[PDB]
Amino acid sequence: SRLDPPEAEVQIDRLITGRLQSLQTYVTQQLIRAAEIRASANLAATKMS
């Protein structure tokens, strides 16, 4: 709502870049935690069986 295309493409490219590293960090960190829940799930399935 604030920025126009001629300045917005460079400034927003910088903002998108930063937010994408933050989302990439979330998903990668979430992948490591998911690996830990997955390992727990493998423990749970073995413990289950």
Next chain:
Amino acid sequence: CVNLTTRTQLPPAYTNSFTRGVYYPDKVFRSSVLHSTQDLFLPFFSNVTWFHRFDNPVLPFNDGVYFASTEKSNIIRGWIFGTTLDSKTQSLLIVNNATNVVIKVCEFQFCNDPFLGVWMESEFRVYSSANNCTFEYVSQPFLMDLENFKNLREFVFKNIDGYFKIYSKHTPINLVRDLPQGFSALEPLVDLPIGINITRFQTLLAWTAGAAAYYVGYLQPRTFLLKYNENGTITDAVDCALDPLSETKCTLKSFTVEKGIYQTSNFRVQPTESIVRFPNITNLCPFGEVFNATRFASVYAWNRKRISNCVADYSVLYNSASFSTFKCYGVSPTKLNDLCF
């Protein structure tokens, strides 16, 4: 020009487009790959208007058209392209190769029902005055006869990035009254460098009538993944926006889809109304009292005039040119009017 009125008036017929309308989107070799391209293509199984007497009315041209003809005695002569198609705008004129293949992008004064003229050629009734010529190209001489089928001519009319690109393919056919099932891709012939805006066209046909028919379909911006084989021929295509199975095919880059769950797009309810609500007070904010003011405070003891509780017409700031240097950080320098502060 002469306006022929001894014409039967029937409504348009419709047929099934099948697998027609795929062309080479680029000039680059690829093989054993599925490549997804977003361009103007004829949709698969699209609703195509079907024309056949001496049947040739005026037709719409929207984003572009797909043209194919099945003929035995070469009646098609060329096309008129334009905005009005009545000599008011630049037009593309294609005369038959009997003289030489000629595509002339000159500025012509057309008659009000233009048509190429000609069994021996006699008449020439395309234009009278002719000046302001901007482009000419002549292809190697051939000959299109001026008086199941065997010869198919296919045309695509595009207006992309300065090029009017014409594609054609000649194949055998074995249908009497329809488009065959099977696949073919349209090869580029010549890249014509004319940046004109074409929205309208008319078909030229070739006193007696011959045995021929032509079909016109319409292109829309769609994404297609085209399959190139080892040899280099495109053998199939999927219009991924035709139906959800093609959507899955488009997402998976394959013509075979396995058992599973596939995410192909995202649904969103679209807004139907635009609701704009600002404060009830309509009093003009005193930016006038700031800018018009006879005396400003000096740079060390600068004044501070607070503005609150009104609507501020930033238009007088945005549209004005008297401000020599309006270089603006923080927010956009022009579209300030669409925010509340």
Next chain:
Amino acid sequence: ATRFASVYAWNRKRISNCVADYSVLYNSASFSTFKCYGVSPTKLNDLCFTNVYADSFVIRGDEVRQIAPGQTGKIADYNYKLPDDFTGCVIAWNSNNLDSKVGGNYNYLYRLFRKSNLKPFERDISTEIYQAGSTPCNGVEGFNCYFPLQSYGFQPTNGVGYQPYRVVVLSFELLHAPATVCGPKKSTNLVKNKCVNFNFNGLTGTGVLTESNKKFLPFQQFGRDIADTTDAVRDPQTLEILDI
């Protein structure tokens, strides 16, 4: 050129299928500002272009150098909106000695306030009357009805800001098609079965050139693999297909 087109109806001369001696551009000093986006301002000679565009026109008054990707204003936005993804550049030099008239070339229309704005790269010769107040106007001029052209105003002693910087926009598209126009290189003999540094019509790399068995179509010049990397080229002098 003796005379160039105005900034609203700027000409477009496409150049293709020849050798482009960029030396006459690179080494020249008469070009006042060669501030060049997209590619290097000096080494233009070492690329092959799919297509080159040449929009040449004349701008003075304000916006003398406001023609740039990501710029706005009266001239750069409502007469010729250079796109924000623009690949290419602008040669500008004052033409006081010749293009500026002894009195004033009042022949460069610049059409301030057409309707709202312009998207990239559409030439609009449309002269419809602009309306902002009373709508009754229909191709007729009235209370709030304008004819929008209102041509430039230059004099020999205009000043550097109001001096006509002759703009020549070389707008290159490097990934559109097989390259057709480029630089004046010596061109050496073709060597096979050896490790070499190659330049095939702008495609550059290091590798070994071997005989290909691919059936290229007559108009098709090169290929790419599943990896979307180059793996085949048609030789530009003899229409033989090589794998690289």
Next chain:
Amino acid sequence: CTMYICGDSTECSNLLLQYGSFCTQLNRALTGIAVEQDKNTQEVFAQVK
């Protein structure tokens, strides 16, 4: 990725598309995570027909 970073914005989505398959990788990874949760729950509880 498009909705989170450029939510309900076509111009911003087109700017993100300039980073190629990063978005597809995050969604694929996250779809895979959802699949992993359905798979692990199905090994622990759905081990009986």
Next chain:
Amino acid sequence: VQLVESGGGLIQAGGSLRLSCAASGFGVRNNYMSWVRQAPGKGLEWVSVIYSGGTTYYADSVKGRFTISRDNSKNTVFLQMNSLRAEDTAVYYCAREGDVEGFSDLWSGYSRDRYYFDYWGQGTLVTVS
């Protein structure tokens, strides 16, 4: 800004002339090009105006005679006068309307209406005799 004028002269009733007004410092396109006649000791009764393009605006009393055109090549406004009458006897001024950013007034942004008058030439006496 300078405005030079020519065309006025001693003529019999019902003749023809051609008024030429060449503008230095501005063109016929930049601002509205109006026509006013100043009768000796009377008001400025507006005659005509050439806009930036395509106008046939005349006064109620002079309809269908005066013809307005421009040669933009030489920056010249032509007013071809045929079938003279009594009231046209006056000093004629080619008037430059206040161009865009009129005297750098700090309120008007590209509104070219601004229906007032900037500096003009010295005027030509056109007499019907």
Next chain:
Amino acid sequence: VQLVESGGGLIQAGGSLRLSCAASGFGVRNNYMSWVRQAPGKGLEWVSVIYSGGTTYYADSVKGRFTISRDNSKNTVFLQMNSLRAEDTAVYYCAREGDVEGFSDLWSGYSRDRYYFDYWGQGTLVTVS
């Protein structure tokens, strides 16, 4: 740009001179500094030229006599004249060769060859008598 010259005068045959040419607005370094003599009612026949550094270029008929040098401190070209002969009687012009970017011609980029002549001074008559 102005070029002032001095040194010419009435001397008997076989004398000696010193030609002084001072350039204001440009130096002896910017462009080639040539020497030409224009005999009364004949062409301007080139004599010699001192380049931006280190030249002993003379005409075929005057080899081994003329000596060319500069004082860059005062921006002055000296042409020391020894062992006069008949044909040297002429008006001598210190000629400024067309410098780099000659009249801002839009084709020549830093090619300082440009073998033509820019503006020069008014010339000194040098007579052998």
Next chain:
Amino acid sequence: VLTQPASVSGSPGQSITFSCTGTSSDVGGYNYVSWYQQYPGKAPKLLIYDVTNRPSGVSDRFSGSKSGNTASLTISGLQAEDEADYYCSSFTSSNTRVFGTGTKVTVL
């Protein structure tokens, strides 16, 4: 044709109010009135466009106004060189401009 007040003579320094009549089509409704000043022989020079707005190079004492079908000039601190007719140019009245007759001031 807008009608203006006749010639008058007076003293420097004080305020003179000259009101000029018009019609409701141009002056009463629309607000693009401008006023000028000319010396016999020289072309008219701009004094006030829109009446409220004042171009540069003009003394600030000049002021004008409009009321209904009438336009008023509240001129202040008259001087010797000020003796010149004042011309009222209103809006172009549906694309046909009209003017007033003229007010010749005199001083002692």
